[PDB]
């Protein structure tokens, strides 16, 4: 199932050297949500300070899309090793 | 209060290249990107290009790509626009816009000038 | 290649909220166009209302405010006033230029 339809994505011609296309031409948006978990080390002297987060990016990439309407297949698919995808 | 004033009118002969100016004054000029705006009688406002004083970075339109060249003097907190190769479709009121964020890209118009007369026949 | 549209002209009386439009060809008008509005009294005298993301120009009195009513740009001036007769150009970015659209004549009426 998942790995179908994951093979039926990249079994097509898919480069994922090239930018996502777009309605309009426009430029892909990304949405960006970002999860401090700990900052630490405030360095006065180097003016500096260390912070480990969880960036999450989001944008639409329609060569991609394999249910599209779905409700007949699973809503979304975690993509596995081995498969390249523009970022 | 801010202000930019520009060059006065000119008229010139199609195939010269003349130059005009925006003098800034009352704020840190080289934090506000400026941008240069085009008002014709026969079309609506175009947008030609802008540039970042800080920075000397240049954007053009891809309309005016070798027709505007814009340049800019920290020192005397001036703006400049040349304009290459002008014919009769260049006449027109050349404005400049300031871009309204501080050192940074915020793509929204503050302040323009009084606009500059740009009156090209032969 | 893509193109933006306005209302010709609108009137309004001294107090009434009116709303003016921009719209763009290509589409929806999305957060990513940046929906500017410029004014534009007479002698040519222009200054910036509204732009960016949700930020405006210095001193743009309160009563403007911006929007994205529908599927376009909308400029909404509750309560006019008489010196709001002007001309409003709004302007859209689309990836990496600006476009202005035909204007819009308001009118508060006298």
């Known amino acids: 199932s998942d790995s179908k339809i994951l093979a039926h994505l990249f079994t097509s011609g898919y480069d994922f050297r090239v930018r996502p296309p777009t309605d309009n031409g426009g430029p892909v948006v990304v949405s960006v949500n970002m999860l401090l978990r700990t900052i630490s080390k405030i360095d006065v002297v180097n003016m500096e300070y260390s912070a480990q987060l969880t960036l999450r990016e989001s944008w639409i990439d329609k060569r991609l899309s394999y249910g599209v309407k779905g409700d007949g297949q699973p809503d979304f698919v975690i993509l596995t090793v081995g498969h390249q995808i523009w970022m | 209060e801010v202000q930019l004033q520009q060059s006065g009118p000119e008229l010139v002969r199609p195939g010269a290249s003349m130059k005009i100016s925006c003098k800034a004054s009352?704020?840190?000029?080289?934090?506000?990107?400026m941008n240069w705006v085009k008002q014709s009688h026969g079309k609506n406002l175009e947008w030609i290009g802008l540039?970042?004083?800080?920075?000397?970075?240049?954007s053009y339109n891809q309309k005016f790509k070798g027709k505007a060249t814009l340049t800019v003097d920290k020192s005397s907190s001036t703006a400049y626009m040349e304009l290459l190769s002008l014919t009769s479709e260049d006449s027109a009121v050349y404005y400049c816009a300031r871009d309204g964020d501080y050192y940074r890209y915020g793509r929204y118009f503050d302040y323009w000038g009084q606009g500059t007369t740009l009156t090209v026949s032969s | 290649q893509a193109v933006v549209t306005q209302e010709s002209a609108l009137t309004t009386s001294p107090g009434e909220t009116v709303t003016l439009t921009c719209r763009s060809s290509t589409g929806a008008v999305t957060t990513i166009n940046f929906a500017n509005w410029v004014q534009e009294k007479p002698d040519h005298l222009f200054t910036g209302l509204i732009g960016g993301i949700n930020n405006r120009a210095p001193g743009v009195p309160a009563r403007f405010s911006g929007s994205l009513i529908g599927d376009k740009a909308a400029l909404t001036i509750t309560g006019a006033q008489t010196e709001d007769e002007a001309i409003y150009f709004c302007?859209?970015?689309?990836?990496?230029?600006?476009?202005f659209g035909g204007g819009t004549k308001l009118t508060v009426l006298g």
């Open positions: 009352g704020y840190s000029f080289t934090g506000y990107t």
């Open positions: 302007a859209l970015w689309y990836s990496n230029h600006w476009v």
């Open positions: 540039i970042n004083p800080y920075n000397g970075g240049t």
